[PDB]
Design a protein around this ligand. Structure first.
Ligand code: HPA
Ligand code: HPA
Ligand code: HPA
Ligand code: HPA
Ligand code: HPA
Ligand code: HPA
Lengths: 233, 233, 233, 233, 233, 233
């Protein structure tokens, strides 16, 4: 029991997929899992447990931004004993080497947040995923024929911004897209000794100005979902 | 249309109540409004429009943390033309001058976030509410007999923390409680020329270690809700 | 006894008006008080005690800038037991909604100083006035017919600056004027549990380039002075 | 004409002594100068011009703290064309190698202010005096038999502080005393191409807890005053 | 031609091994390469080109610390067109999961330097290696039977330090060791679009207080050297 | 014995000259010293002891950048008991008041490094040389007829940079040139109670775009070398 999660200890399997959108979490539960059970629903933030190809797997929403994400994965790990967390989110492309609905594997998450300086003695924490998990994503993607765009993302506290050249500067330093949680996920998992990785599909393209719709941000990423399930098997 | 809000321009009245919990938003819509209509539900984040004592009033969830809160109130103001925003949230008491379920009116919101330094040339932005709105809360509370605890809050990116003396230091500087959105609400509303105020009821007490339950964080604050509705009339 | 104040404990009433200019302090003592007594004069920084409409009231200069201001109000509170401090200063307008000699009530004081980060764990301290005092200023001003411009000010360590767009950015965030002490006054009073408020009359207008003379910065603000005396009665 | 200085261009000689205390400025004018004229008195901050051993010399108060000091020396240089500025102030000893009324020549001024980061692209500005001036102080002191304690000072925005080990750390890095203006004097003079130096006599000893009285901070430093006059001749 | 490198464009192969110690660079050139040629020797910082198993490979020293390292890899990439850089350095273990002469593959490099904030708009740059290169190290190590310790390192500007609990905090966040260049290597390579990776063998153990000798820091790491050569083939 | 220095305690005289280039150290040993002995050579970083005009004097390389420099002078002082350190380096002119091969005496070293904030409680450490040593350089230079350009330098973590106006800003604040170690030398020597000074000859001119060759950075500065030897006699 926590303020933000309804479940009981033991309702989460040691492996969990995460999205910011609890309706994408719910879409995965209905369409892709076998006998999925809704295990938590505080604040409308749904989580599920189910089976994929016989293997037990949980799903959990984490809301938008580092602060929200940190609340949920801190609770998932410390209270519910989750050991592997795989975010499958959305992001805004800043590279011309990626298009709408490309899947990005974030091997580092830069940030404009202060959370990691607060965690880490006002130094620069290099927020990174678990290496075996990213190895696992790479092999599963190749064994499935899924093209994976690999690089850094920029985890921002902001979605709306008048910046322009800051995006060029991020792209110049090999950042493929902008999202809002990976750096918090990575740092919390480092703190609490869990294995984490973040994949994100391109829902917005800041160069071409393309943007998916709310429901397309649920429905348009099934290869991302399949990759995540296949590697958690 | 935005990525995070379903409504159409015109579905929001110029005055809106806000909670982090969309189920508290929904509880207010059912119990306190007349003919409330669900106007948005992306990501399970519900908003409503309705009437209170004949006056039109909207409700909207904003999730947890400054980054989430900023997304929604940026959209509420710039896209949906909302002019007055009154957050009615929860907070964790750090003062022995306040107990569980006291209502705190935040006349300033300190923060450990970097968002305001990013907004404001790496200077110190004093995140404050609209003065008329806080005047309005003060008179409505006195005209209703509601005791209002008035002071600063600390808006943190963190809910879980091993800090101890940092809380004494916040209390020493007249901070009554900790929450996670007021400073973002205030700064975004300053940027976009809207009127904002944050009230928060004490759901956790960091001195006595009392903590309400998830549903009590919905149900235990009806004087806060009534005060907010009465001042938006 | 302190290095900077001559008076004896008990020479200050629990309520004190403050200016940066000790000659404005002296002007208020001569013209507006009954039987004012000079109680301190170290470094030419004059303070007085007197009566207004029968009520005892003290006056004290605090010099220019946060560091100077902090020295005097730290001593006023800790040594001389002053409980209410009302600065009545000058400021430079950055809003076209205010003209020369408008009175600004500062409900928040942003700053480019490091003093509050040093005080407050390198976080953002939202430097705010006492709420009852600002309520008291608002009602007294309306009961007297004085138009009060209400908003944030920016307390700078600098008077002279080549900045330009930084001023637009401050104005965009609802800052009405620039001065140099409010944030230090507010933070010191928060630390030491006194009630503080800052009013400032517009002596310079950064848009129109108007600027009062040294003596006009003493003489041109009698409604500010009257408002301050009337609320301390 | 400026907001803070009464004099006319030409009333200041190109060489000026400075104190925070305008009454120490006045004490030097009466006792040590020939036919001293009060040339400015805004805000009770007195300045004088006079002759010493036939050589013209000006005196000027600058108040307490970097922000105040910066206002006056910016005006002295840009408006009044002052070319050499020699502060002769007070300071609080943190070294056991110095006693009450020792004279300290500050060849660097560390600071806890943000002013130099604001001036200097958020880098570390090493605030230093003019070299010829410090050479001149060294030879004049030896040619007069005055023992000069030479080292860094720490220019703080704070006079009152509960720090303890921070003072040990400053002493460990060869800081002899704490004062409140040298770093601003040095940086402003660097900006505006004037020659500046700061001497400070020990008025407080933070180890032994000795502290001079307000008038002793005027009267107890005549060798400092004589050294300053002799080098400006 | 640069101030720091003697070679001619074309003397460096597109793949280069790097050490801080140019004598370790020289040891690799003598013992492991075929017909190695010394191609640069400014400041005694030796670089070589040679062949390993028929494949051309270069070696280059980079000195100690981020600033030194950045000079050399900026020149290697921009002037000499080097495309792949593989540092094989030394580090100080802070984990009890690693012993003297373990090989650490750094999938992120935290830092206490300001260089990446200067590069990256005062945000947090997550300094990471090229993913294919780390994949290549992982497979080559397994295909050779070399046990690879995988995790973050902390790149410090300091070798000597009285810190204690800061090391516990780094270890708590999954940092295996401390060194002094990886973060600069990674960030410069990100800027200039080269592929970089850092391996480091444990030469000091901060828990057990073991420390190798200067020559052992040359000679004790042949599996690291072999792994690097085998993956550059 | 240290990881970076071969010598034995007692092989260093209490006075040492320093260069970044160990080949400039070696050039001074051959050409200017009597019976110079190579006393250390770890990492190709050569140091020597010898006699000049009968007086014992040591030489030592320190590599490039603050981090490298700090390692060597920390060891020189704490392990080898060196008491006086005189860097004679190269720098890049940003003033039109200095030309190629001018000698600059650095009476302060600004920096873009974080090392001094880490050392000094995140305050501004004014990194300065020993005063007697700079007095000694000034008199020896005049007694020899050597023109000495005196002022601040900017110690950067970067050699290559696209900055432009930042250089104007440094020049505006009386910085004569850019180098990469003085601030670390000064701060380490302050920490460890040694006497340090930095001279630097202009090897690059950022205004005129002149740049010496690698060997000219060894050979073109004999008056600097002679001045350093003459003052250590
Ligand atoms: O454009 C974006 N910015 C930040 N987060 C996002 N998630 C999807 N798109 C975006
Ligand atoms: O304890 C708390 N901390 C932060 N936010 C909160 N909202 C309710 N309680 C808390
Ligand atoms: O223009 C100003 N700037 C700062 N403080 C002031 N006080 C009056 N005018 C000003
Ligand atoms: O103790 C002090 N602190 C700061 N400034 C001072 N000026 C004289 N004494 C002091
Ligand atoms: O202990 C160390 N600290 C920093 N760098 C190092 N390189 C080898 N050992 C170390
Ligand atoms: O141009 C330079 N920049 C930094 N350090 C230097 N040392 C010689 N020239 C330079």
């Amino acid at each position: 029991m926590t303020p933000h999660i309804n479940a009981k200890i033991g309702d989460f399997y040691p492996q969990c997929l995460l999205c910011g959108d609890p309706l994408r979490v719910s879409y995965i539960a209905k369409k892709f899992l076998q006998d999925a059970k809704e295990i938590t629903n505080v604040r409308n933030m749904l989580g599920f447990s189910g089976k994929y190809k016989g293997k037990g797997i949980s799903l959990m929403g984490h809301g938008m931004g580092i602060a929200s994400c940190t609340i949920y994965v801190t609770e998932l790990i410390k209270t519910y004993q989750v050991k592997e967390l795989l975010r499958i989110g959305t992001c805004g492309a800043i590279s011309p080497k990626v298009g709408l609905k490309d899947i990005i594997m974030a091997t580092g998450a830069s940030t404009d947040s202060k959370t990691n300086r607060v965690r880490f003695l006002n130094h620069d924490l290099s927020a990174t995923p678990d290496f075996e998990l990213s190895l696992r994503a790479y092999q599963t993607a190749k064994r499935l024929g899924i093209d994976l765009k690999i690089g850094n993302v920029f985890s921002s506290d902001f979605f709306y911004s008048f910046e322009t050249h800051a995006f060029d500067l991020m792209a110049q330093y090999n950042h493929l897209a902008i999202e809002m949680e990976a750096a918090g996920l990575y740092a919390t998992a480092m703190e609490l000794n869990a294995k984490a990785l973040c994949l994100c599909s391109v829902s917005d393209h800041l160069i071409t100005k393309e943007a998916l719709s709310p429901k397309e941000r649920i429905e348009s990423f099934d290869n991302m979902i399949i990759l995540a399930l296949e590697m958690m098997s």
